[PDB]
Amino acid sequence: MEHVAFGSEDIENTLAKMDDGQLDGLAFGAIQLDGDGNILQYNAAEGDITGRDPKQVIGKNFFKDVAPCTDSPEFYGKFKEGVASGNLNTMFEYTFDYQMTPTKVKVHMKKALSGDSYWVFVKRV
Ligand SMILES: *C(=O)/C=C/c1ccc(O)cc1
């Protein structure tokens, strides 16, 4: 395991040092998105929660292609306000239900350290 707690205050500093292999050792799901919502990184824990194959979803658009249930003011709307303003730090519960058993999760979205990149962190609740 790579020990990092979900919700930690300096999580973007800690994860800036990790390659794809180290991201797969986290205890929670982690997705890195660019400012258009395309998936740059997607770890093994996220694939275990959602059933998606991490290697196949890289390069797809999260809001248009992979996760249409997040195309809503409650999720995508918060993301796009964050990208526009250049700052984002929000945590909320949500249900993922597209082509899968509905699964309740806690989501934490936070701007990365790398300029136009954004994290989505996910844990079961
Ligand atoms: C709703 O369509 C949610 C889908 C989803 C959430 C998170 C993922 O990693 C993959 C699909």
For ligand 1, the distance from its centroid to the CA atom of residue 67, given in whole angstroms, is 4
Residues 80, 74 contacting (CB under 8 angstroms)? no
CATH number at residue 66: 3.30.450.20
* Chain mean position to CA 14: 15
Ligand 1: residues with CB < 6 A are 31, 46, 50, 52, 66-70, 96, 98
For ligand 1, the distance from its centroid to the CA atom of residue 66, given in whole angstroms, is 6
Radius of gyration of the chain (CA): 13
DSSP class of 3: -
Number of independent structural domains in the chain: 1
Range of the domain at 87: 1-125
Paired with 111 in beta bridges are 118
Classify strands 117-124 and 39-42 as parallel, antiparallel or unpaired: unpaired
